[PDB]
Amino acid sequence: TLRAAVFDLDGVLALPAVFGVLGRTEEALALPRGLLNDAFQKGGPEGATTRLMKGEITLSQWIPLMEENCRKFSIKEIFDKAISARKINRPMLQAALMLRKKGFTTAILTNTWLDDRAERDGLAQLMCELKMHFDFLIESCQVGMVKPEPQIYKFLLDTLKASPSEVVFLDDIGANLKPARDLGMVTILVQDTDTALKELEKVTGIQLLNTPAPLPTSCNPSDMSHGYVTVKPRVRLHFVELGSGPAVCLCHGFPESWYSWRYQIPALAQAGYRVLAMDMKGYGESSAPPEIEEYCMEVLCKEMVTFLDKLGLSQAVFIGHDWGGMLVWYMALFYPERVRAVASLNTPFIPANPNMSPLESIKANPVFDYQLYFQEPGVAEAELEQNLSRTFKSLFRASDESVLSMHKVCEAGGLFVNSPEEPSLSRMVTEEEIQFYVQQFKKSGFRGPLNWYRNMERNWKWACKSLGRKILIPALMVTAEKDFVLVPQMSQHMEDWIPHLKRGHIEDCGHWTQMDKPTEVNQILIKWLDSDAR
Amino acid sequence: TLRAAVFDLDGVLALPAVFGVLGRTEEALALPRGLLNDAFQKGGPEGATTRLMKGEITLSQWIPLMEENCRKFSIKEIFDKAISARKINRPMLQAALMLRKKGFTTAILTNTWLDDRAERDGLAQLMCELKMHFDFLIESCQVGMVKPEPQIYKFLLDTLKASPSEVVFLDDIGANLKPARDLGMVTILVQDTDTALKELEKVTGIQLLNTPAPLPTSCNPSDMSHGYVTVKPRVRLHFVELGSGPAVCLCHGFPESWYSWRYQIPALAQAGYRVLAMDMKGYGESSAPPEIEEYCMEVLCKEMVTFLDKLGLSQAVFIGHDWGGMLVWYMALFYPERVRAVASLNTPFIPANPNMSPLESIKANPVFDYQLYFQEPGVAEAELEQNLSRTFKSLFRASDESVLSMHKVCEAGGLFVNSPEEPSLSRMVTEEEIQFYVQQFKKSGFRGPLNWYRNMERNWKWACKSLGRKILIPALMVTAEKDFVLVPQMSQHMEDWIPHLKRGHIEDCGHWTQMDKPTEVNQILIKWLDSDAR
Numbered sequence A, B: 001t002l003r004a005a006v007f008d009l010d011g012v013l014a015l016p017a018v019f020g021v022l023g024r025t026e027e028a029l030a031l032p033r034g035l036l037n038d039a040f041q042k043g044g045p046e047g048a049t050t051r052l053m054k055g056e057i058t059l060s061q062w063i064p065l066m067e068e069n070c071r072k073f074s075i076k077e078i079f080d081k082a083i084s085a086r087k088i089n090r091p092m093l094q095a096a097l098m099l100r101k102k103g104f105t106t107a108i109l110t111n112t113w114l115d116d117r118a119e120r121d122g123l124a125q126l127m128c129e130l131k132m133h134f135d136f137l138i139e140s141c142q143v144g145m146v147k148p149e150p151q152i153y154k155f156l157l158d159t160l161k162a163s164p165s166e167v168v169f170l171d172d173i174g175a176n177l178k179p180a181r182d183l184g185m186v187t188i189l190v191q192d193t194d195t196a197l198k199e200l201e202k203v204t205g206i207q208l209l210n211t212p213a214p215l216p217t218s219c220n221p222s223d224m225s226h227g228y229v230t231v232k233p234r235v236r237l238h239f240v241e242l243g244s245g246p247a248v249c250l251c252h253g254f255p256e257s258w259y260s261w262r263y264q265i266p267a268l269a270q271a272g273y274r275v276l277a278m279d280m281k282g283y284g285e286s287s288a289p290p291e292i293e294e295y296c297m298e299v300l301c302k303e304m305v306t307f308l309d310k311l312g313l314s315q316a317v318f319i320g321h322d323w324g325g326m327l328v329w330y331m332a333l334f335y336p337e338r339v340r341a342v343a344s345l346n347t348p349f350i351p352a353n354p355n356m357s358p359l360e361s362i363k364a365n366p367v368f369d370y371q372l373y374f375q376e377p378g379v380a381e382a383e384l385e386q387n388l389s390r391t392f393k394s395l396f397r398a399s400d401e402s403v404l405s406m407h408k409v410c411e412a413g414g415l416f417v418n419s420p421e422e423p424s425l426s427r428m429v430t431e432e433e434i435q436f437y438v439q440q441f442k443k444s445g446f447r448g449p450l451n452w453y454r455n456m457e458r459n460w461k462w463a464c465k466s467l468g469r470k471i472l473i474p475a476l477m478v479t480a481e482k483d484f485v486l487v488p489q490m491s492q493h494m495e496d497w498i499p500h501l502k503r504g505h506i507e508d509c510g511h512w513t514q515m516d517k518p519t520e521v522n523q524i525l526i527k528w529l530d531s532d533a534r
Ligand SMILES: O=C(NCCC(c1ccccc1)c1ccccc1)n1cccc1
Pocket: A253, A254, A255, A322, A323, A326, A347, A370, A371, A395, A483, A484, A485, A486, A511
């Protein structure tokens, strides 16, 4: 009965195999067949390559020793190109992910080297992306043992804490499968991926080939780097941070969390960006002062500028959703020198109407009735804090799962009045994800978050100062077909204010854009970032 | 009686003045005198420039309006160059810093614009470096008022919470000084810096001109972004983070803190690097598990790799001092693909002697006697934890302030036996800086830090696996003339292991390199980083 899956790297999790380049070179340079591949293995267990793979010497030390073996054109150049060309075998990783998702312990067991080349980062990035999807990574150069030595196999089993018969082992080198087979492990010789995966699904009884497109990698809160900046005496801001490159500040909506970006954080970091996923003021681990004035856009934006000041960041690209999207447009209007680029999901840019009170403007739209219900301090807090699991389960649902009516909320005297006490779990979320939001809202409740709605006049007066301005920095507006509150048509006039505005549109997408359509959100954001945010 | 100092930006804190470029252009292009400067002021308070300076419109909106005024060659090009050329007037900032150091409230009061140019970052960086040295920054485009309007002056006084006679105001525009003068503020017309500073020191009674070279900017712990990464179930690592660019991981020595890099953090961030100043395992806010094995180099290095993994960093340049320097050489030897570049202060790279026990090797050097005293669990903890203020005051001193004998520590039965109970405060540190170390060591004590010395055999066996390797990634060795334990001569053989090793040497420098010689440390590190670490 299988419970562990082991994969080789070269020719298995990463393709094309670096081993099959010596032969490729021979053919291209019309060299005697197997000349380079023979130099590579010269001396066998006593040879330079075994010393390299055991970690006795580094790759830069091995390069000249290989050159001496070849003289039975550059070895460095051949290997630099082979390593650069080698990329993740996505269907193999998909299978490993599905196996781990089903309860399997997974490991990469690889014959590798200590890379000290000037271009070592490329491989470092590859190992990083790959390894975080596995329980263990066993490298020959770190353990001082190599496949096919039987000791590395006993080391693998001790690491897995599993009997050989519980382990499936995948490798492209037949000689490296033999010791695992001899111990009683299920083995798979990997030539083409499809066949290897058919063999894998046959032995495990788990569908691995032709399966639906998986969701992007999410975040485990306990595995993130958590950051804290005090922006003023009584206010600290919490954020989750991942990746390197240009800073990308993610701003959630109401009533959310940094975790609402769980599907974007790993994808944007992988894309070459330094992601800072905020807990906005009033939320999660960030401070939640009680005063209403603490949540007007002018103060919220000033604190986000201080946040950048304290971190030593001259700029960040600002990406917001819902109330976070509203904040990012004001960041672009009032602090363009600090905003590298601005993007909003669902939230359109609507200039203040100087000839109408914001209270009047909100009364004009029937979908915005819930906002008037939110005005009186304590009323909405009571209903939203009564049962947290019910609040999040009722709120976080796809366009076709609605249990809420946001019309005549005041008249009915509640957001959840003719809504169930025990809502069914939406297909967008797990019970554990709901419980994360529940645990977060137990710290400060809904006062700070609802205070974001209690500054209409204050925000209106501040916004009026920007009525003569235009947004001329790079900007992206992403609309969601099925958001019935922040409707796509509400954004129709944006290019009058943002002439160079770029757009994205997500069909069959509700309000909770990031979790409703994670793959498409990531595709739109990464594409825009690489073209407009450097 | 003065207690507040106010400075203009253009032509005062930043030079050359952007205003004096329209005239420079006229002369270079042989245009009728004052043509461009007249277009710039066209319409006066009703004109395009006043609207710009009040924040009604952005710089990119103003550009074409200026062009229409000029037609009574590119306005954008002229302004892009003028802004890029404008740099901090270092002696003016030095004076503002000395005034604030003496108890003065300081502010920048400036007529500026909302910059949305493609090249806005240059100015954003300048404002960032400047503003953090002042109590307030008042910008015309944010406050909706401009100098010389009297309202901005009343706004300045309300912001300062000071009567006009308590305020000195420095400006290069005579018309802008008049309202401050009329209110009873001491005013200084700034033409050349030296004269302005003579006037400033005359009115304040504080020496501001010809004063000694100040120390680099330090860190206020409460104003830093603090980060936390869980590397394994019972171990979390704390770090302080500042800046953007390539990641630079700072590793302190024994018995130190992230704060030991206080003079380097702002300088390296300013130099264009993303600084991660660690609290090493066993210290400050990082976890301090009690087991000795938790502090062997193999585990310490593995956790630093996990730290990078969790933050999404494929590499970091590793800079260490003392025990941190020892760790960085092992990082370079065992994980070169994760080390962009390696630098050590004081700590040489000494390969393990495979023909001699590390206990024997330590017994050979009389200066290393304190290390044998540190072996027995509980003995050194008791002495170092007895009085924390005494420990740090006795330890942290310059080469000429020694109160400690590190010879025959065992024979004398203590590190501080013939040392004072109340040491005098060293000239390298303030009482407040000592108290920061005191408060940090109250959390975990000296067990975890001393455990770094309790893995000699374990570290020796691991180091022996690297005896066939060479360090071939970029490397820097910095020696301190007067470190009497980590002597410069101990590093003499390093190029046998690190052929491409670069060096730095600090004369009249004791063991506590970062605080003994901050300016020279920063100069050596920044120079090496820009040339070798990208
Ligand atoms: O009220 C705002 N967003 C919350 C909408 C949300 C919601 C409404 C009411 C309570 C909680 C959350 C919603 C949920 C489902 C569908 C559409 C919209 N905004 C006001 C300005 C910018 C955003």
